Amino acid sequence: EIKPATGRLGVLVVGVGGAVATTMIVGTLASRKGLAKPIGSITQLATMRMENNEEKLIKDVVPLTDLNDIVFGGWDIFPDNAYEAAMYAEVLKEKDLNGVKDELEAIKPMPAAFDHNWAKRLNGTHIKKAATRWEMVEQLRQDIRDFKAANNCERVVVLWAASTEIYIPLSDEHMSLAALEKAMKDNNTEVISPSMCYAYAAIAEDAPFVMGAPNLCVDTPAMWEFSKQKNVPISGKDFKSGQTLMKTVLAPMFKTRMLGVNGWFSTNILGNRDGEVLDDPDNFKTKEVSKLSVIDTIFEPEKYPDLYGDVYHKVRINYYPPRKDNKEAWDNIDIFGWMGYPMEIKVNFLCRDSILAAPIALDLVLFSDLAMRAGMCGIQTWLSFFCKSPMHDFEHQPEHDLFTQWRMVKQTLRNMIGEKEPDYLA
Amino acid sequence: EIKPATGRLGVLVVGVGGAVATTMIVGTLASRKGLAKPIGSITQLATMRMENNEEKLIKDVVPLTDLNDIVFGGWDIFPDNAYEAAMYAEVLKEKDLNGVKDELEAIKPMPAAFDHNWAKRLNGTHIKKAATRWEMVEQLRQDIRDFKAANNCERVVVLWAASTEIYIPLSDEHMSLAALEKAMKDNNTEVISPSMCYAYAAIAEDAPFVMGAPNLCVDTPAMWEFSKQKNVPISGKDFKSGQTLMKTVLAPMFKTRMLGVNGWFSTNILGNRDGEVLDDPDNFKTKEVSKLSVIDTIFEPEKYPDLYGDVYHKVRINYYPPRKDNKEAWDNIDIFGWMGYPMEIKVNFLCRDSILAAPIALDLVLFSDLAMRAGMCGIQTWLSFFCKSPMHDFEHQPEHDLFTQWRMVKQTLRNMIGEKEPDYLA
Amino acid sequence: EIKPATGRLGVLVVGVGGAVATTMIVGTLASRKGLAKPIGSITQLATMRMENNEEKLIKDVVPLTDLNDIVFGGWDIFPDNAYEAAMYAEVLKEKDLNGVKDELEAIKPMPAAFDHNWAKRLNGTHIKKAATRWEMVEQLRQDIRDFKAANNCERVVVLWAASTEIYIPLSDEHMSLAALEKAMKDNNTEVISPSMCYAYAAIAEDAPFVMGAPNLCVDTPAMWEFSKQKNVPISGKDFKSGQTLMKTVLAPMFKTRMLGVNGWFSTNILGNRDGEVLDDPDNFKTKEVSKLSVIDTIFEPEKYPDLYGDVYHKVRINYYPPRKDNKEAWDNIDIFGWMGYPMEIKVNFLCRDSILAAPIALDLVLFSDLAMRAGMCGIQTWLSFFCKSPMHDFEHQPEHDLFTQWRMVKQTLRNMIGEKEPDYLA
Amino acid sequence: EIKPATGRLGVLVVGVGGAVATTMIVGTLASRKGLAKPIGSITQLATMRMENNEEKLIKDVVPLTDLNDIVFGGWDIFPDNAYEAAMYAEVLKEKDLNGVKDELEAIKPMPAAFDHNWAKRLNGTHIKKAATRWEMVEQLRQDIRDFKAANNCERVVVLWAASTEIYIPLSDEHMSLAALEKAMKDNNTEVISPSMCYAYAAIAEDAPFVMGAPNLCVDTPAMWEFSKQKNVPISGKDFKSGQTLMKTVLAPMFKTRMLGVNGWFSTNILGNRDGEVLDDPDNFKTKEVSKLSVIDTIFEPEKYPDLYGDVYHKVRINYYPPRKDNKEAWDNIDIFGWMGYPMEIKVNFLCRDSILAAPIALDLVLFSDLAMRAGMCGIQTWLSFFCKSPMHDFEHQPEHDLFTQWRMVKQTLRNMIGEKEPDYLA
Ligand SMILES: NC(=O)c1ccc[n+]([C@@H]2O[C@H](COP(=O)([O-])OP(=O)(O)OC[C@H]3O[C@@H](n4cnc5c(N)ncnc54)[C@H](O)[C@@H]3O)[C@@H](O)[C@H]2O)c1
Ligand SMILES: NC(=O)c1ccc[n+]([C@@H]2O[C@H](COP(=O)([O-])OP(=O)(O)OC[C@H]3O[C@@H](n4cnc5c(N)ncnc54)[C@H](O)[C@@H]3O)[C@@H](O)[C@H]2O)c1
Ligand SMILES: NC(=O)c1ccc[n+]([C@@H]2O[C@H](COP(=O)([O-])OP(=O)(O)OC[C@H]3O[C@@H](n4cnc5c(N)ncnc54)[C@H](O)[C@@H]3O)[C@@H](O)[C@H]2O)c1
Ligand SMILES: NC(=O)c1ccc[n+]([C@@H]2O[C@H](COP(=O)([O-])OP(=O)(O)OC[C@H]3O[C@@H](n4cnc5c(N)ncnc54)[C@H](O)[C@@H]3O)[C@@H](O)[C@H]2O)c1
Ligand code: NA
């Protein structure tokens, strides 16, 4: 039984002043007015073959929030409105911003729960004054309540589209809800991320949460416990948009064709606010761990020792101001075929990072809202498709193969309406 | 009921002295003696999840001919034995050839049914003297019969691994078996390819036929009629090994992610005997048509006009002696995402052409032998996976998506033993 | 004695409505008004060390026409004014065109001497009606005279910046001025190019002529004879802007480091009006011959047989609408070092063709005007630097090495003012 | 007055067991026997135009040591002979090693002056037991004396071809010979490199010294003082073989064509013993500083602020075992032309590092020997051509432009025999 998508959906974005957030916002406002097309959006454009073999838009098969019913808001450490912030990001042409300037200028960031130590390269001013991690939680819950009431929203989704936080490991404080709350109250600044405070607030307020950065946040037993108790879906993490998208397509190719891999080198140059943050090696590490993780379970080295027994995998990210938002990736893959003979594949992907990630953020938001109305909660395995590091508990492995991930999306969608695929190939 | 793989399989290769043929041969002889591994071979290495969820090697699920039971022979316009021909091709190191030298030297090409006009840049003289296309057929049937008897083969498969022939269109003479035979007898050398003579002979002699080049041959109503009458499988065409393999992996990626494509340019440089032939524009055309054909049914431009309504697709092949057998591909793909913003992907694939195609030729041969023992005949749709231009009749469309093609392979294999997939994801 | 640059210079451009012509025009108008910088212009920006070791701008060492004293006009088969033509070409942003719109709109093409057969893929109709090649000459001389009088120009230069014409060989009619005139009068439309009619008219009217395309035109004994009789400079041919620029830089590198070259493959993709024309193989050939010619005299294979005795050199140009004016080049160079061991260099040059060629066209024009005021005539060897196929008579070889070519420019400039280089390194 | 090259030259290599050293050795032994060609060697293959315009081999213009008169030896921390070490390095085919195996096996490394702290990733055993830096000096002088006597060498050259040492800055101890000696005696392990001990020993023993790594060593006032006092030439540093060679060719191209540069990103992957050492960031730094230094003096940002006022330059080196000795470089250069419009150049250079550097090491050795016999001493500015970081005192700037560097080589060679260039272009 799926609750219908009635009334307005508040989409509250952490980092609402960021490149990805503003691009998603501009694209949504323009798309719903017929001034642009939501290219790259599964929710808006993709179709599926149904049990009776009819081909339908996914949006016509399950009840999603209509773009016209979305109201955007959120938090940032810079006070600039969505228009000012989009002008700064330099992703979109002025004529695209101008077409929705009226609406953009009216989207204003609330002050952020921020800790300088977690993103050292940023120096914004628009930050809450907040006694403890737990005070951050309480202020954020207030903001959600205020926003819902002021904008007449039936439901909310909270999307983290803010900066990559410093690397931190799993620890004792993350192992249960009680321990996490205690650490929040003691103001444990080392194990409690700002992001965890927004996630807690979101779940406490019946709002699905999406982690679009590679941050340790909802991938902890404490959050699995809380989200399940509250009947809230959590999804993550790290939008899979460009270089990693490609990696989770070519690795399946080598696997499907039983070709061996000796090595895979991946590098990137980018010069945006994302890149500025990632220039701190501590923040780099968080991205690196995520990027590195996507091939092992595809190859399965223990099962195919003669193909993948010895893959040397290395990823690098380089701050490079000339590229701005347009991350450029270069990959070199050393493979081998018949009789062990080696070959090389070079890929140069000239991305527009925020262009690629904008529809992915929209899709995660709209599918998260659907998941809750469909009675789903805890880790949304079915949304692995959208993410570099698909969240999983200690009894499950992440699935990384894009094509298998897409099948998982379709399977859950069909299941939601009590249907099966019309045949194996669909 | 699948007939068991007893006794010896004769594998008769048209172009047995060629780069792909000798590479497949060397690798098979070495593999079966434990001097090399058949990397790239689905038949030898790939596994599948079965109905009860056990994972097994395909070769342990269906009865295939054991490598030890294969005997190689075939035809070429050059008289060199398989050792001399492998040394000429320069694909494999001498240390690899040396390990199986005695067996290679014993593989000697029978004189070919050849027409200089169909492959003008070749000037070998190990050719039959044959008054008519029909006499070519009869001599080829004799050779098959002689080989089976001399080598004590229970069954035969004929693999065309010879040069790409000049472009010719579908014509009246191809539209029924009666018309094709008539044209053979009248010696119509403009509509009857040499390859059609080998295909006819193979089918007439109860031998599955595989077209590993892009030649018009078994993709005609005449051959669909004949193969059905004789209960023989036919498969083709054009081994999908390198640049085109990649095309049928990336195009599914763009499709799965709802990314638009404005254009796709593919070029390559190669300096082998394959390249010598393809330097004739007439022979180039045959390859070009095949390479061009692989994206339309993936994109479906009529269904997604806003993504793929206007793809400019161009392929080039350039003779380049320095590369030898190591074809080098360069591709530039112009794509667009959210709100129509353009991006570019450049792919540089340093192929070893014959290394990539060798396991594909082996797999087509072994699966063709299985298909016949399993009572299958006519167009082997299930082997689309191995081919750039999957054969199809006028009531079916080719499927090009590698991942879907792999599912087609598994589905037929499961069906052969009366099983279903354990679940949608398997 | 160099005649001073007084009064106005008429710069009459064949193909004044083309991508390169309009880009040069816009940039000159904007530069002189301080709305842009003439990046890439030797005349505007380059310096030289003088005999007394002072470093000066070239424009301060020899008397050039000031940008403010240039008046543009010319011919095209499309009647669009320079503004409309610049908007069509899509090289420059509207904000750049807007700054000089009034001046651009006032530049209007005179009807062209055109022969459809020489550029078949173009179908403009702003063409003269002219019974014979000779009548073309006379009408073009009239246009030059009219323009000089109407715009109060002291001097004129004629720049061919129009489409690459079909390949034609040197022939009897080109071997003397008398024979060329005879062929013009007999209306021999097979050996007399339209471009030859513009060149004749320019020379007849005391106007230096620059061939910016690879056309057979002023590289004939007839034009060497005429330009000498009239004391007019002629320069050419084919602006060296992008891929070929790089070729004449890397080949000197391999030479200077005594590295061998086995092969060099050059391809590109472009979708502009240039590309439309070059899609005709006959027009392609003209470009191809020019691009192929630039390495032999650098390598000197007869002198260094062990390095360059066997270079396989191949160039391709591919029409590709998605690229528009932004030609994209890909090169693969196979080199070898110590003990013959091979290595590879891949170059991907994302050009803006008209951006690269614009300053080159301006420099050729301004240096040609200087050359005549300095009493120079016939083949301007010293301007080889700007050209893919430096013009030369039957007793001289072209010099292709960019760095040597630059030295040739400086040497002539120094000589013009009776100076020597201060030292060998300057 | 040039002393003739009589008798045998001892070429003593620090790191005689290394990839570059063994490649140079094998190539020299094979070349002098006509079993291979010394491709890449200026000394062996390059010609020059002389004052009377005759073109001659440099080796026929100045007296160099004949390859037949070279005797190789040196030091390493691994005791393996030159044959064993070359087999380990995997640069050269076995058939090339086999052809000179007899001579190679007879080249045995003397125990090294080594300090683990300066190259932490190496753990060889074949190291001297040496009380102090000064004891290292005295033992090394003994080794040189012993070698000269045992092999009947008239002259010696010492070539450092050993591992890149950790970064260290210039300091007080380097500022005079007296201070350097004092620091050596006090065993100042922090400011005195092992390399400095070999350099001191070489100069003390009348042997020119070449620094083929980027190490601080002879680029100190102390060594300038000593080398001048002893009348010994010193040259360095860091062979310029591959990616940096290219950088000092393309930067001159942009300069010569007045094109602006916004950025230049350079990365590398390599998996050899060199790469193992450079995996330590301290050792990386030494290479990085050297690689970064080569463009500033080419561009001259203060002179051309509108072209080069703001170049973002970044270099990376990545350990990557699959590449072995075959370093692979990728560069992205952001340039701009006319009216400020941006363009991009991508270079992928698949090097064989030791193949490229072997002739450079030979040339520096043979030219160093010539320099001394020609009465030259101190910093050999004229050998800048061969080096990434041309050594210079505090009153001189390095020249990096390859083409200018080549002219400097020719100028010194001509000067040595009292000749001038025949003309400016030669
Ligand atoms: N762009 C892509 O293709 C892509 C792909 C993978 C993941 N991501 C991740 O998405 C996130 C956003 O990307 P972006 O390019 O928009 O970066 P951005 O820096 O432009 O946007 C992030 C915004 O979050 C703000 N912010 C940081 N910490 C905050 C806090 N505690 N509370 C509120 N606001 C905060 C920043 O001030 C900034 O405005 C990053 O983590 C990035 O790595 C993006
Ligand atoms: N190599 C690959 O990766 C690849 C990819 C696509 C398809 N193919 C196709 O496979 C075929 C074989 O490729 P290859 O590289 O081994 O080429 P090859 O030139 O080495 O071909 C094999 C042989 O075919 C022989 N031959 C030609 N016409 C014949 C005839 N009528 N009868 C008998 N023998 C004949 C030739 O003499 C040659 O020795 C070609 O058509 C090629 O285009 C190969
Ligand atoms: N763009 C570059 O970087 C580059 C490099 C090499 C050389 N070139 C050559 O420069 C020329 C101009 O290049 P473009 O990109 O501006 O091309 P374009 O097609 O935009 O050319 C300019 C114009 O020439 C006109 N034209 C053709 N024939 C004519 C005739 N007989 N009389 C008068 N006008 C005529 C066409 O109508 C067109 O508008 C081409 O031949 C091109 O190959 C340009
Ligand atoms: N390969 C190239 O193209 C290239 C280019 C630039 C510079 N270089 C530099 O040249 C040097 C040698 O390069 P390689 O590839 O042969 O590396 P390598 O590691 O193969 O060779 C260096 C050798 O020196 C030895 N060694 C180290 N410290 C020593 C000491 N104190 N005394 C004696 N032996 C010592 C090592 O054990 C090793 O055998 C490195 O500094 C490298 O960075 C080489
Ligand atoms: Na890197």
PDB file of all heavy atoms in Angstrom, chain D residues 37-48:
ATOM      1  N   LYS D  37      72.648   0.033 -32.492  1.00  0.00           N
ATOM      2  CA  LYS D  37      72.902   1.414 -32.872  1.00  0.00           C
ATOM      3  C   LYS D  37      72.665   2.316 -31.667  1.00  0.00           C
ATOM      4  O   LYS D  37      71.671   2.165 -30.943  1.00  0.00           O
ATOM      5  CB  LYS D  37      72.009   1.806 -34.047  1.00  0.00           C
ATOM      6  CG  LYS D  37      72.286   1.017 -35.317  1.00  0.00           C
ATOM      7  CD  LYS D  37      71.074   0.902 -36.220  1.00  0.00           C
ATOM      8  CE  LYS D  37      71.237  -0.176 -37.279  1.00  0.00           C
ATOM      9  NZ  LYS D  37      72.373   0.151 -38.174  1.00  0.00           N
ATOM     10  N   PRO D  38      73.554   3.307 -31.444  1.00  0.00           N
ATOM     11  CA  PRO D  38      73.414   4.211 -30.309  1.00  0.00           C
ATOM     12  C   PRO D  38      72.426   5.360 -30.560  1.00  0.00           C
ATOM     13  O   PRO D  38      72.772   6.539 -30.394  1.00  0.00           O
ATOM     14  CB  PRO D  38      74.884   4.674 -30.170  1.00  0.00           C
ATOM     15  CG  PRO D  38      75.381   4.785 -31.590  1.00  0.00           C
ATOM     16  CD  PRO D  38      74.738   3.600 -32.283  1.00  0.00           C
ATOM     17  N   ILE D  39      71.190   5.006 -30.946  1.00  0.00           N
ATOM     18  CA  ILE D  39      70.115   5.948 -31.225  1.00  0.00           C
ATOM     19  C   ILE D  39      69.972   6.890 -30.024  1.00  0.00           C
ATOM     20  O   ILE D  39      70.076   6.437 -28.895  1.00  0.00           O
ATOM     21  CB  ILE D  39      68.808   5.174 -31.485  1.00  0.00           C
ATOM     22  CG1 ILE D  39      68.983   4.025 -32.492  1.00  0.00           C
ATOM     23  CG2 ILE D  39      67.676   6.124 -31.886  1.00  0.00           C
ATOM     24  CD1 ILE D  39      69.350   4.474 -33.882  1.00  0.00           C
ATOM     25  N   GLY D  40      69.754   8.188 -30.255  1.00  0.00           N
ATOM     26  CA  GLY D  40      69.582   9.084 -29.122  1.00  0.00           C
ATOM     27  C   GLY D  40      70.894   9.711 -28.633  1.00  0.00           C
ATOM     28  O   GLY D  40      70.871  10.607 -27.790  1.00  0.00           O
ATOM     29  N   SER D  41      72.042   9.235 -29.146  1.00  0.00           N
ATOM     30  CA  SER D  41      73.339   9.776 -28.722  1.00  0.00           C
ATOM     31  C   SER D  41      73.786  10.926 -29.624  1.00  0.00           C
ATOM     32  O   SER D  41      74.048  10.720 -30.818  1.00  0.00           O
ATOM     33  CB  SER D  41      74.414   8.718 -28.695  1.00  0.00           C
ATOM     34  OG  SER D  41      75.669   9.318 -28.433  1.00  0.00           O
ATOM     35  N   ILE D  42      73.932  12.124 -29.032  1.00  0.00           N
ATOM     36  CA  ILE D  42      74.457  13.271 -29.766  1.00  0.00           C
ATOM     37  C   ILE D  42      75.911  12.981 -30.165  1.00  0.00           C
ATOM     38  O   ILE D  42      76.331  13.206 -31.311  1.00  0.00           O
ATOM     39  CB  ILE D  42      74.269  14.582 -28.949  1.00  0.00           C
ATOM     40  CG1 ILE D  42      72.877  15.208 -29.133  1.00  0.00           C
ATOM     41  CG2 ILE D  42      75.334  15.615 -29.289  1.00  0.00           C
ATOM     42  CD1 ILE D  42      71.709  14.291 -28.913  1.00  0.00           C
ATOM     43  N   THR D  43      76.695  12.464 -29.218  1.00  0.00           N
ATOM     44  CA  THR D  43      78.121  12.247 -29.442  1.00  0.00           C
ATOM     45  C   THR D  43      78.345  11.274 -30.597  1.00  0.00           C
ATOM     46  O   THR D  43      79.235  11.512 -31.412  1.00  0.00           O
ATOM     47  CB  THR D  43      78.905  11.824 -28.184  1.00  0.00           C
ATOM     48  OG1 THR D  43      78.460  10.554 -27.712  1.00  0.00           O
ATOM     49  CG2 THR D  43      78.909  12.864 -27.084  1.00  0.00           C
ATOM     50  N   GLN D  44      77.508  10.227 -30.684  1.00  0.00           N
ATOM     51  CA  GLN D  44      77.734   9.165 -31.657  1.00  0.00           C
ATOM     52  C   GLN D  44      77.115   9.468 -33.023  1.00  0.00           C
ATOM     53  O   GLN D  44      77.645   9.014 -34.038  1.00  0.00           O
ATOM     54  CB  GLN D  44      77.289   7.790 -31.148  1.00  0.00           C
ATOM     55  CG  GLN D  44      77.945   7.397 -29.838  1.00  0.00           C
ATOM     56  CD  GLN D  44      79.454   7.463 -29.933  1.00  0.00           C
ATOM     57  OE1 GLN D  44      80.065   6.761 -30.738  1.00  0.00           O
ATOM     58  NE2 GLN D  44      80.059   8.336 -29.143  1.00  0.00           N
ATOM     59  N   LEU D  45      76.016  10.225 -33.060  1.00  0.00           N
ATOM     60  CA  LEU D  45      75.220  10.285 -34.274  1.00  0.00           C
ATOM     61  C   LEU D  45      74.996  11.703 -34.782  1.00  0.00           C
ATOM     62  O   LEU D  45      74.649  11.858 -35.950  1.00  0.00           O
ATOM     63  CB  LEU D  45      73.859   9.614 -34.029  1.00  0.00           C
ATOM     64  CG  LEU D  45      73.861   8.106 -33.773  1.00  0.00           C
ATOM     65  CD1 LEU D  45      72.430   7.608 -33.683  1.00  0.00           C
ATOM     66  CD2 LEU D  45      74.615   7.344 -34.872  1.00  0.00           C
ATOM     67  N   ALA D  46      75.057  12.732 -33.917  1.00  0.00           N
ATOM     68  CA  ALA D  46      74.641  14.055 -34.388  1.00  0.00           C
ATOM     69  C   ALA D  46      75.712  14.704 -35.270  1.00  0.00           C
ATOM     70  O   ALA D  46      76.908  14.482 -35.066  1.00  0.00           O
ATOM     71  CB  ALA D  46      74.244  14.957 -33.231  1.00  0.00           C
ATOM     72  N   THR D  47      75.258  15.527 -36.234  1.00  0.00           N
ATOM     73  CA  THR D  47      76.144  16.317 -37.080  1.00  0.00           C
ATOM     74  C   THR D  47      75.942  17.806 -36.814  1.00  0.00           C
ATOM     75  O   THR D  47      74.981  18.199 -36.159  1.00  0.00           O
ATOM     76  CB  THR D  47      75.832  16.090 -38.563  1.00  0.00           C
ATOM     77  OG1 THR D  47      74.538  16.653 -38.737  1.00  0.00           O
ATOM     78  CG2 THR D  47      75.864  14.634 -38.990  1.00  0.00           C
ATOM     79  N   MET D  48      76.814  18.635 -37.393  1.00  0.00           N
ATOM     80  CA  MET D  48      76.818  20.079 -37.212  1.00  0.00           C
ATOM     81  C   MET D  48      77.291  20.674 -38.536  1.00  0.00           C
ATOM     82  O   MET D  48      78.076  20.031 -39.224  1.00  0.00           O
ATOM     83  CB  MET D  48      77.897  20.367 -36.165  1.00  0.00           C
ATOM     84  CG  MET D  48      77.828  21.715 -35.543  1.00  0.00           C
ATOM     85  SD  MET D  48      78.628  21.615 -33.943  1.00  0.00           S
ATOM     86  CE  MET D  48      80.278  21.060 -34.389  1.00  0.00           C
TER      87      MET D  48
END
